[PDB]
Amino acid sequence: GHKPEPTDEEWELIKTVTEAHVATNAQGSHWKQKRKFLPGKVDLEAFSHFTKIITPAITRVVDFAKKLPMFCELPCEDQIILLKGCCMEIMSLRAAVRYDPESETLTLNGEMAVTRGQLKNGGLGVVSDAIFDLGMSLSSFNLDDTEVALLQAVLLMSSDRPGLACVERIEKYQDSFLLAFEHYINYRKHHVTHFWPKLLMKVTDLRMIGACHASRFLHMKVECPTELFPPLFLEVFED
Numbered sequence: 020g021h022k023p024e025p026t027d028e029e030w031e032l033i034k035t036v037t038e039a040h041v042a043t044n045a046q047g048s049h050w051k052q053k054r055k056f057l058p059g060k061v062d063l064e065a066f067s068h069f070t071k072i073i074t075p076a077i078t079r080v081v082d083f084a085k086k087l088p089m090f091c092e093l094p095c096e097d098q099i100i101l102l103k104g105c106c107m108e109i110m111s112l113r114a115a116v117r118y119d120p121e122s123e124t125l126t127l128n129g130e131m132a133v134t135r136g137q138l139k140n141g142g143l144g145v146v147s148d149a150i151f152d153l154g155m156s157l158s159s160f161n162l163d164d165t166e167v168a169l170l171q172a173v174l175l176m177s178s179d180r181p182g183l184a185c186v187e188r189i190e191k192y193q194d195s196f197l198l199a200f201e202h203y204i205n206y207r208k209h210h211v212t213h214f215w216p217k218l219l220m221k222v223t224d225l226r227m228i229g230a231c232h233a234s235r236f237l238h239m240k241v242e243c244p245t246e247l248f249p250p251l252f253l254e255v256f257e258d
């Protein structure tokens with residue numbers, strides 16, 4: 020095939036998703052007049068800071084979803100289970116794409132730039148390695164707002180999260196994003212062989228992260244109290 024580009028209706032969908040994304044980006048991308056770095060084998064420092072931005076960070080993934088018509092058109096019950104399943108996957112994506120090879124740091128909530136270790140011992144553990152790997156891995160991809168946005172959309176519209184009722188519709192919306200995405204990619208023409216396949220594999224990585232983080236939080240879910248974690252963090256990442 021000549022690799023088709025967006026259709027009239029897809030272009031409309033792409034504009035809609037990009038806007039949802041751009042609007043709920045932390046700053047959107049000018050961690051240049053914003054970010055600033057952090058001066059043990061636990062990091063009460065890094066951790067304390069994390070507890071401070073983790074909330075607005077989760078809040079903007081919710082606000083991204085509230086901005087997708089298809090998503091608003093879902094029963095709040097599925098809307099909840101859907102958000103909880105892709106929350107970490109979207110946050111990590113958003114952080115991964117802000118990896119600065121120079122400073123070898125990611126940028127969280129578009130304000131705090133952290134190192135691998137800082138994030139590793141600030142509460143994420145090996146996940147930090149995973150998101151950092153993904154970050155470096157993505158430089159080569161060169162993704163714009165739309166691609167990242169579509170990616171978040173695809174992650175959001177996962178019909179495999181247990182408890183969903185409107186599974187078929189969620190699958191319909193997803194395939195719909197996937198296609199628009201695939202065509203947007205046809206238009207972009209990245210100088211990367213097998214770019215589309217290579218990309219979808221990153222989604223599997225973001226999913227893995229999601230699962231590892233879930234496993235992670237539950238293992239400590241109750242070795243630690245809740246006096247430590249922001250209420251919103253708890254509403255999301257505990258069963």
Ligand SMILES: Cc1cc(OCC(=O)O)cc(C)c1Cc1ccc(O)c(Cc2ccccc2)c1
Nearest residue numbers: 045069070073076110113114127128129142143
């Ligand atoms: C990867 C990331 C992205 C992020 O927002 C990025 C963005 O969307 O701009 C914010 C944070 C704190 C992080 C790191 C993080 C994510 C989940 C998580 O459970 C932890 C450990 C933690 C858990 C509760 C309180 C503080 C720290 C850190």
Ligand SMILES: Cc1cc(OCC(=O)O)cc(C)c1Cc1ccc(O)c(Cc2ccccc2)c1
Nearest residue numbers: 041046047048049116160161162163164165166
């Ligand atoms: C430097 C950069 C990096 C970037 O990272 C993603 C990528 O480059 O693929 C994205 C953008 C849009 C930019 C630059 C930019 C320049 C002018 C401009 O009007 C825009 C879009 C925009 C304009 C005003 C406010 C927010 C966003 C981006």
